[PDB]
Amino acid sequence: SGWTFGAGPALQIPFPMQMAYRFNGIGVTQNVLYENQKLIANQFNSAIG
Amino acid sequence: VVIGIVNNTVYDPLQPELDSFKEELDKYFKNHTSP
Amino acid sequence: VVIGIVNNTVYDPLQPELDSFKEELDKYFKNHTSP
Ligand SMILES: *[C@@H]1O[C@H](CO)[C@@H](O)[C@H](O)[C@H]1NC(C)=O
Ligand SMILES: *[C@@H]1O[C@H](CO)[C@@H](O)[C@H](O)[C@H]1NC(C)=O
Ligand SMILES: *[C@@H]1O[C@H](CO)[C@@H](O)[C@H](O)[C@H]1NC(C)=O
Numbered sequence: 001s002g003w004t005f006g007a008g009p010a011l012q013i014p015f016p017m018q019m020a021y022r023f024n025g026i027g028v029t030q031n032v033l034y035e036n037q038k039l040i041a042n043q044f045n046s047a048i049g
Numbered sequence: 050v051v052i053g054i055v056n057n058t059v060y061d062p063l064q065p066e067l068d069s070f071k072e073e074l075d076k077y078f079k080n081h082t083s084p
Numbered sequence: 085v086v087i088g089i090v091n092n093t094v095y096d097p098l099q100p101e102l103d104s105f106k107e108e109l110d111k112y113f114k115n116h117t118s119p
Contacts, residue, residue: 016053034051063101071105078112 001010002018013021016037020030033040 037050037052063098067102067105074105074109075112078116082116 002013002021004011004013016033020033023033024030
């Protein structure tokens, strides 16, 4: 759901489109995520490990 | 490079805004060349 | 009035946007005035 579950009915949204919607808050545009998608995924995985 | 991108048409507004005038420009020229 | 401003050219995209038709417009006028 994302941030919506904490402010109303809990609406649904795919996770690869709920991180392209959080780069925008930082300042970097969203396209960067899709263009690095796979790479970023691996990094995140390694991070948790 | 992006996964899940879906085919469609994008209605770039600037073109029909021009094309609203580009449709009438070409027709006018041909009439004046007729004589 | 500003300090540190630097001379350069600003690529106004709308100008080539209209030039995409203006060039062939000049071509059409060349055809218009050729005979
Ligand atoms: C969405 O997920 C399903 C199963 O997880 C998969 O079969 C489908 O291909 C996915 N959609 C896209 C666009 O990859
Ligand atoms: C989109 O259209 C292009 C050209 O018509 C085609 O090559 C491509 O396979 C299409 N992709 C999808 C997902 O429909
Ligand atoms: C910028 O260009 C203008 C005219 O092209 C000129 O008068 C002026 O001296 C130039 N300024 C600098 C800092 O180059």
